[PDB]
Design a protein around this nucleic acid. Sequence first.
RNA 1: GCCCGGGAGUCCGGGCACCA
RNA 2: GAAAGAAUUAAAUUAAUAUAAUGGUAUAACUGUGCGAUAAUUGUAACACAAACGAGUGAAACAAGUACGUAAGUAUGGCA
RNA 3: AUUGAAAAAAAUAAUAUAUAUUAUAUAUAUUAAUUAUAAAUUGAAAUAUGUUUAAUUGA
Lengths: 332, 52, 72, 64
Amino acid sequence: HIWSDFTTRPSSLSIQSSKVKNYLFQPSISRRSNRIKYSPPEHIDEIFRMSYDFLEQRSSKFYENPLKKDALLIKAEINNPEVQYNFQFNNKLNNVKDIIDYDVPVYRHLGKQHWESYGQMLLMQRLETLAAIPDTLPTLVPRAEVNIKFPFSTGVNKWIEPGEFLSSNVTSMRPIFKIQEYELVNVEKQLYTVLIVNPDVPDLSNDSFKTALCYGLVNINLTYNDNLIDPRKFHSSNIIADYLPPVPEKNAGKQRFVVWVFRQPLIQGPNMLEIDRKELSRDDFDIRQFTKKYNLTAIGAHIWRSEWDAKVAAVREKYGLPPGRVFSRVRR
Amino acid sequence: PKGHKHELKLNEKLKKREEALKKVDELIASKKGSKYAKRVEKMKKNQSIGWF
Amino acid sequence: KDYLAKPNILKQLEVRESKRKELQDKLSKVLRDELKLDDIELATSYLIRVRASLKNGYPIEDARFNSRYYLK
Amino acid sequence: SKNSVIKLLSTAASGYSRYISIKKGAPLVTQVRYDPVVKRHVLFKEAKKRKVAERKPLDFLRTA
RNA sequence: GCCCGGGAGUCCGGGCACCA
RNA sequence: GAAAGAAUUAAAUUAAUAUAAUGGUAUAACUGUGCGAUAAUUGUAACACAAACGAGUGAAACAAGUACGUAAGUAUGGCA
RNA sequence: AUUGAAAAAAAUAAUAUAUAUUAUAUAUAUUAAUUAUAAAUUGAAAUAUGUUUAAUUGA
Ligand SMILES: [Mg+2]
Ligand SMILES: [Mg+2]
Ligand SMILES: [Mg+2]
């Protein structure tokens, strides 16, 4: 009876609600009439118990280098009904430590699986279709989710779907990222960088486009449960290029703002890096070159896109920028 | 001056047009089906302010 | 389309503004009733922001912090 | 001989018509199209009346 | 296209316009 | 060592294409299915091909509205 | 909600209600329906109300 024990095993592996647990072991549907109506399938109890016993035994058997160990742990746990209940029926985004610990490997694995099932795929699609990858950064291999938000301007709460159109109002002030890491990585020593690039600003000299780096964080510390990049966490030492908002010029297409997240190269403590904050040209910016220089590995990405609107002038004024150019409606 | 036939029957025509406009969407819905109508209703309900 | 639906949008915005103003006034009144010191306008604005945050999905302290940060 | 022309009048009474060809048997046609007077799509309906090759109304309500 | 003769439909024969 | 999945390679091709012949077509245009009966809509069409003229052909883009699509987009009748 | 059985809550989505924003968001509640649609004297079923039989049960 290993799943009943909670000495070494974290407390998150159990269902925190007691009633539910009781129901499971010998319901939730709140309304009384509805409950009355409900009629579960026969012989569920004994068979379920037997199954539990079997799986528990298996887990015990499983129970005994780091990555391998983690994998083993995951294997042992996954079939626990309680853990499944916790994961499936509680929110993974705004995670709550005790219900779902991403410190715990099983939960992390589950999260990864979930991501693979949908969100990751969606992100990939958005990248491919909108020509984010080949245009800015050759390729990526998903690794970790990255969800952005724009809480400060306007005041509303929404996780941005990849490849959305945001109003200039919404993207007036900086965003918040949540880099949900998986894959058994170090937490103390591993640092991250985050770059919001937009590759389609009009170059009149060449007649093509040039890529601007509108926001740049480096040397961020992350944790499996604690990963929201709010002004609380990063401090002014970590910003290499402070936030500039999307201010598309009229008839300059739809500008794609693509947030990239990279993990630092790993050598005792947390390894930092200087990045000549002054020297680095942000107005025109080579992402690939930058990566080559500091040997980054892009883990995750997200993307949105902005268009001109009446509001942008005001935004520009607020930020103390030029009045903004205007382009001919024809693609001559 | 009496006014040209087309010039005197103008206001009435306009009124008729307005009336038609008022009762055109419904007609379209009817032509289409019930599902379409339902969809339209849903859209109307939506409650989503855009931007300019 | 924009031209068509611009006036309506403007009207909506105006309405929203009015509502906000009303809320602010209410907040001010409440403050007065309480007897707290106040700058006052700023405080009211902050309060409104906090309220908005609360209305949307935010833990209260976090929401407050966010509001503060916006002002900053 | 097989294909006759017909005039389709805008259901919005702008008096903007459009013409199409159909078989003689063809069902009573309607089509929603753009009306440049009203500047929006509207139903266009047959103006002149014409006999139709009658089809039996298919029965969804399991009769007899 | 419209009008006849052999409620609707089919199948046949007359006309009446169109004939630039 | 097994099971399942994802496939990949080979063959693809005269089957099918509303309709002659030709060229194309599995990355399917060929077939099945959901939604839809909407691009078998409305103003300007540059510029090409072709071309004695009259004509013909492809068509970017601008603007108005519509359909499907998570999105990217796609649709100004039909693989030519 | 009242009937059965023997403090609460923490996904997704759907529905109901509210509000936030020149952001089709958020908060609270509940998890419905999933192959149905008019018109049948003799088919079948159930319930309510009587009488009889082995206060009730069955028939
Ligand atoms: Mg062929
Ligand atoms: Mg086709
Ligand atoms: Mg010519």
